[PDB]
Amino acid sequence: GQKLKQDGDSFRMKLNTQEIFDDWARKVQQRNLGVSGRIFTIESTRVR
Amino acid sequence: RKLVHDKELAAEDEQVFLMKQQSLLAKQ
């Protein structure tokens, strides 16, 4: 029984989830997504 | 004095209008 509980605790520890949340939040803050600016943009492209 | 139709509706090709408005966006 204690062997099984230790095993399950080990897998659950390997099955944590908050770290990916933290990583995604950090990446979102770093990239600094935004929409404010002009209504629409006109750009230069040399279409093939 | 039979009147003739005046200047027709112009096209003002998309490229020129886009360039003018790109300039206006750049200056604003």
Swiss-Prot record, chain A:
Cellular compartments annotated: Cytoplasm, Cytoskeleton
Disease listed for this protein: Charcot-Marie-Tooth disease, axonal, type 2O: An axonal form of Charcot-Marie-Tooth disease, a disorder of the peripheral nervous system, characterized by progressive weakness and atrophy, initially of the peroneal muscles and later of the distal muscles of the arms. Charcot-Marie-Tooth disease is classified in two main groups on the basis of electrophysiologic properties and histopathology: primary peripheral demyelinating neuropathies (designated CMT1 when they are dominantly inherited) and primary peripheral axonal neuropathies (CMT2).
Protein family (similarity comment): Belongs to the dynein heavy chain family.
Domain notes: Dynein heavy chains probably consist of an N-terminal stem (which binds cargo and interacts with other dynein components), and the head or motor domain. The motor contains six tandemly-linked AAA domains in the head, which form a ring. A stalk-like structure (formed by two of the coiled coil domains) protrudes between AAA 4 and AAA 5 and terminates in a microtubule-binding site. A seventh domain may also contribute to this ring; it is not clear whether the N-terminus or the C-terminus forms this extra domain.
Function, in words: Cytoplasmic dynein 1 acts as a motor for the intracellular retrograde motility of vesicles and organelles along microtubules. Dynein has ATPase activity; the force-producing power stroke is thought to occur on release of ADP. Plays a role in mitotic spindle assembly and metaphase plate congression.
Subunit note: Homodimer. The cytoplasmic dynein 1 complex consists of two catalytic heavy chains (HCs) and a number of non-catalytic subunits presented by intermediate chains (ICs), light intermediate chains (LICs) and light chains (LCs); the composition seems to vary in respect to the IC, LIC and LC composition. The heavy chain homodimer serves as a scaffold for the probable homodimeric assembly of the respective non-catalytic subunits. The ICs and LICs bind directly to the HC dimer and dynein LCs assemble on the IC dimer. Interacts with DYNC1LI1; DYNC1LI1 and DYNC1LI2 bind mutually exclusive to DYNC1H1.
Name the record gives this protein: Cytoplasmic dynein 1 heavy chain 1
Complete-protein stretch covered: 679 to 726 of 4646
Curated annotation (Swiss-Prot), chain B:
Family the entry assigns: Belongs to the dynein light intermediate chain family.
Protein name: Cytoplasmic dynein 1 light intermediate chain 2
Full-sequence portion shown in this chain: 346 to 373 of 492
Protein encoded by which gene: DYNC1LI2
Compartments, as annotated in UniProt: Cytoplasm, Cytoskeleton
High-level lineage: Eukaryota, Metazoa, Chordata, Craniata, Vertebrata
Organism: Homo sapiens (Human)
Signal peptide (UniProt feature, chain positions): none
Function, as annotated: Acts as one of several non-catalytic accessory components of the cytoplasmic dynein 1 complex that are thought to be involved in linking dynein to cargos and to adapter proteins that regulate dynein function. Cytoplasmic dynein 1 acts as a motor for the intracellular retrograde motility of vesicles and organelles along microtubules. May play a role in binding dynein to membranous organelles or chromosomes.
Subunit organization: Homodimer. The cytoplasmic dynein 1 complex consists of two catalytic heavy chains (HCs) and a number of non-catalytic subunits presented by intermediate chains (ICs), light intermediate chains (LICs) and light chains (LCs); the composition seems to vary in respect to the IC, LIC and LC composition. The heavy chain homodimer serves as a scaffold for the probable homodimeric assembly of the respective non-catalytic subunits. The ICs and LICs bind directly to the HC dimer and the LCs assemble on the IC dimer. Interacts with DYNC1H1; DYNC1LI1 and DYNC1LI2 bind mutually exclusive to DYNC1H.
